[PDB]
């Protein structure tokens, strides 16, 4: 029965929603290693966009 | 009949606590202004004992 | 609940001798054991409460003694002769067995009906019933007494929903009552109200404590509807330009939105509108950001000003300062609030100023305070009549924030994510204050004015993070009142009221305890020391058996984290040499009463003050209407004794003697001291002389034995007892006569009345004038 | 005969400490602010030692 | 009906819900105005204004 509460107060201690998260996520994820080097040099890093946008 | 039940037995009472305490059990017979349910408190004092 | 006494407590005893010619009438109270050196007062309480305890007059009480008679068999005697009391049938016996002796003719026919008609029970004007009966003069005072101070207690029904009309609230049900509770109701209730502010003055924060975790637990669980989290972040997201490619400050803002502490947030919020003066703060981070910034506005538009101190004022405006004002916290160090609130506004921010909320009038009066007016804070600075914030200009003010350029000349991202941010607090504000409103008048219907004057947040415990600020305003939720948080929150309301009861109780005998026993302070040594040995003395005694001190007080003494006793001892120890005014109870008036009696009239408890020893060869003026042989009663002692005073002399000094054969060989009264004696009144004729012998001498010092009369009757033609009297005893002890002790033949003296009110009288255990709504 | 100073300077007839505002100075130091550049918590760390 | 003297009265919550108000409006309707008190009258009425 405490699985069901966590789960239920996820919801409530983040602004956010998996349906969000996977929105954010399709942005970020293998953006920076498609990019060439010299692009690469003036683009975030992938965890630093993940620490931005959470 | 002038009652469904009689609001108390005339014989059986000696005094005024007697006569309250049955009114107070046979009230629940008759049609109520208020029916009653929990009292509410609001002064109460306890004073020095022994 | 009153006790109603079947039967007046009496304790006259006839003895007569085995011839009958004396006869007398005793009372027994009982022999009490008194000492020397020690404060007499203290010990006339001390036995002053067990005689209270044996006459059944320490608890309250009233008097049912009216139904105890019966009526005669002649036609023409229509009166009640009342049952309690010395029965006259026993003294008709002991007078027929007198005249028995002096071969005088019985009793008459018209002489019986005179004496059997003594003890008699009539009705009084108003209704009472008067009983005369036989009785002793020390429990008819005391008696007496008693009675009249219970019956100032006891009111009629009328009379105490009058009193107490001024403090029902508006929605409860009103309760009916019967005809005869309204035409013969009565009530034994205490009127007086014991304050509560010694204990919430001496120790500030403990008190406080306590009654704000009661109410948080309390507050904490009232149900609320609120929007989803969700839907707000997308709602604001879309009112400015939030997107998921790009750093931006909105982003920053909806990142730590957290509903989790909503309701302790909430809690503090109504504790904050219900109280006088509860202070709250927030501690930002080092390097402060924008949610920082939301939150310190926050706190200045919707927070009451009463709650915001001035040093949280300074600290909320530099940080303002800091963020919005290219400026670091060095800078702004000794800036004044003047200085800080020039500089936000030169740079455009308008959000600088503290508001004041606006207090309502609770409808009834708040418990505990007669004859006064209470008052909450409205939540949200909102003014009831307006309907809106206090400050007028909001909208504008908003409006400029959303125009203005802050923490960049080119670009409006910092005004407009908080100028959507504060609009959105502002509409939640605006519609959901009512509820608030109405949770903290309830939550306000529960505390005292002394409570909410005094009462103060010190300890810093309930504090709030700009997070949770931040959150709470966004996501306002709207108060729900179930039914089921309304019966809660009534049994609360007499849990608290029992409380505050149980603790006025406890103030009254602390200040009671601490006037009686613990005297001044002084800078000298030995002072401090006999001070704390009294006060160890005190704590152990009282805290033994069943503790004097209720367990709620313990607790609310505890909370900080003594053992129970310690706290108990330093409150005590605050409490030395106060100025505040104390109510003399009935039972307090009842022991003094007694305890005066007891010190005025030391014969009635079997013990003396002075007492006299002389050589049987000098005679001696004696109480002879006894009859008793070689009496050695007084009826006072004697100043003169054959034509020269009789010398007196300190126990003290007596003890510290070493010539006692001298000074005994003229007899002397010895006085300075209690002596406690008893006897034992012998129906037959013998030798009058004590149990023991009246002095011992020691090497360290002389005593005199405990005295035990054994008194017998005289037959005047005796030659062996009066031969054995002369020869056998060669010296005497007198002590003053016993006022208990009284012959029959004055029997008049003991008849004595008793009122006992009407029978008519119905009695009101729940004098509760309203009803529980569901 | 002697004289010896009363330890941690407590009057017997005032039966509290000489200075008669530390209340008032102990709330001064839990609502004040000491250090806010660098650390957090002095002032109400200060005064809870102390209270 | 039958007996002009006798009243009704009716007590609602601290905050009322639609089913207070629709007993309070069904009370001032459809009962006689002779058997609601005017202190009853102006509860009903503050009970609507919340």
């Not at chain 3, 909410?452 to 700009?466: A, H, T, V």
């Not at chain 3, 005679?619 to 009496?631: C, I, L, Y």
Request: aromatic share 10%; hydrophobic share 35%; charged share 20%.
């Amino acid at each position: 029965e405490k699985q069901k509460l966590d789960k239920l107060k996820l919801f409530e201690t983040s602004p956010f929603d998996p349906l969000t998260i996977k929105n954010n996520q399709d942005v970020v994820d293998k953006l920076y290693a498609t990019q060439s080097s010299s692009i690469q040099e003036v683009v975030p890093t992938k965890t630093f966009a993940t620490e931005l946008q959470f | 009949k002038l009652f469904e039940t009689s609001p108390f037995d005339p014989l059986t009472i000696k005094n005024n606590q007697d006569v309250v305490d049955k009114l107070y059990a046979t009230q629940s017979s008759s049609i109520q202004e208020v029916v009653p349910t929990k009292t509410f408190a609001t002064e109460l004092q306890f004073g020095v004992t022994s | 609940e009153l006790i109603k006494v079947p039967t007046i407590p009496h304790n006259l005893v006839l003895i007569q001798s085995d011839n009958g010619k004396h006869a007398l009438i005793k009372e027994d109270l009982g022999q009490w054991p008194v000492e020397t050196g020690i404060s007499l007062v203290n010990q006339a309480g001390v036995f002053a409460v067990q005689l209270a305890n044996k006459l059944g007059i320490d608890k309250p009480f009233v008097l049912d003694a009216g139904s105890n008679y019966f009526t005669d068999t002649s036609f023409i005697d229509t009166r009640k002769y009342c049952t309690d009391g010395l029965s006259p049938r026993e003294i008709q016996k002991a007078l027929n067995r007198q005249r028995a002796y002096y071969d005088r003719p019985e009793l008459t026919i018209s002489e019986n009906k005179t004496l059997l008609s003594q003890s008699i029970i009539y009705p009084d004007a108003d209704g009472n019933d008067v009983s005369i009966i036989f009785s002793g003069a020390m429990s008819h005072a005391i008696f007496t007494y008693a009675q009249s101070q219970w019956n100032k207690n006891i009111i009629k029904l009328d009379d105490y929903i009058r009193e107490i009309t001024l403090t029902v609230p508006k929605q409860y049900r009103p309760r009916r009552f019967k005809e005869i509770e309204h035409t013969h109701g009565y009530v034994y209730r205490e009127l007086n109200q014991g304050s509560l502010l010694p204990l919430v003055d001496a120790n500030l924060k403990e008190s406080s404590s306590y009654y704000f975790k009661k109410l948080m637990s309390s507050i904490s669980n009232v149900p609320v509807d609120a929007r989803t989290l969700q839907s707000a972040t997308a709602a604001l997201a879309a009112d400015t330009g939030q997107a998921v490619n790009r750093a931006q400050h909105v982003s920053m803002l909806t990142n730590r939105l957290t509903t989790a502490n909503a309701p302790t947030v909430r809690a503090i919020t109504v504790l904050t509108c219900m109280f006088k003066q509860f202070r709250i703060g927030m501690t930002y981070a080092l390097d402060p950001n924008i949610m920082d910034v939301a939150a310190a506005t926050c706190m200045l538009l919707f927070r009451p000003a009463q709650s915001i101190s001035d040093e949280q004022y300074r600290y909320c405006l530099q940080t303002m300062a800091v963020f919005l004002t290219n400026t670091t916290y060095d800078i702004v160090n000794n800036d004044t609030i003047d200085v800080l609130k020039m500089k936000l506004r030169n740079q455009g921010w308008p959000f600088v100023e503290r508001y004041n909320a606006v207090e309502i009038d609770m409808s009834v009066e708040p418990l505990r305070s007669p004859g006064q007016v209470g008052r909450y804070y409205n939540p949200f600075n909102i003014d009831p009549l307006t309907k809106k914030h206090v400050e007028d200009r909001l909208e504008e003010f908003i409006n400029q924030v959303q125009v203005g350029r802050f923490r960049n000349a080119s670009g409006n991202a910092v005004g407009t994510t908080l100028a959507a941010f504060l609009r959105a607090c502002r509409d939640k504000t605006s519609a959901n204050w009512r509820g608030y409103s109405v949770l903290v008048s309830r939550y306000r219907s529960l505390i005292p004015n002394e409570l909410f004057e005094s009462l103060r947040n010190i300890s810093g415990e309930y504090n709030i993070n700009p997070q949770d600020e931040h959150s709470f305003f966004f996501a306002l939720a709207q108060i729900n009142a179930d039914d089921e948080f309304i019966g809660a929150i009534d049994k609360e309301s007499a849990e608290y009221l029992d409380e505050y009861a149980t603790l006025a109780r406890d103030i009254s005998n602390s200040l009671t305890l601490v006037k009686a026993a613990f005297g001044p302070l002084e800078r000298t040594s030995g002072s401090i020391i006999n001070h704390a040995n009294n006060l160890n003395k005190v704590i152990n005694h009282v805290f033994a058996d069943k503790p004097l001190i209720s367990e709620t007080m313990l607790k609310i003494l505890t909370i900080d984290g003594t053992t129970g006793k310690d706290g108990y001892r330093n409150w005590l120890d605050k409490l030395v040499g106060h100025n505040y005014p104390v109510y003399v109870e009935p039972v307090v008036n009842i022991m003094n009463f007694i305890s005066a009696r007891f010190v005025a009239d030391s014969s009635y408890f079997g013990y003396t003050n002075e007492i006299m020893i002389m050589p049987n060869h000098i005679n001696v003026p004696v109480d002879d209407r006894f009859g008793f042989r070689d009496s050695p009663f007084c009826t006072s002692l004697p100043r003169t004794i054959m034509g020269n005073d009789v010398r007196r002399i300190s126990y003290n000094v007596f003890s510290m003697m070493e010539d006692i054969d001298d000074v005994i060989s003229e007899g002397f009264i010895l006085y300075d001291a209690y002596f406690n004696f008893s006897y034992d009144i012998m129906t037959t004729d013998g030798v009058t002389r004590l149990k023991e012998d009246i002095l011992i001498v020691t090497d360290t010092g002389n005593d005199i034995k405990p005295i035990h009369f054994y008194i017998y009757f005289e037959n005047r033609n005796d030659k062996k007892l009066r031969y054995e009297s002369k020869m056998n005893v060669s010296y005497r002890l007198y002590i003053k006569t016993p006022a208990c002790l009284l012959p029959l033949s004055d029997y008049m003296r003991a008849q004595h009345d008793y009122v006992s009110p009407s029978s008519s009288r119905v009695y009101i255990k729940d004098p509760a004038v309203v009803y529980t709504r569901s």
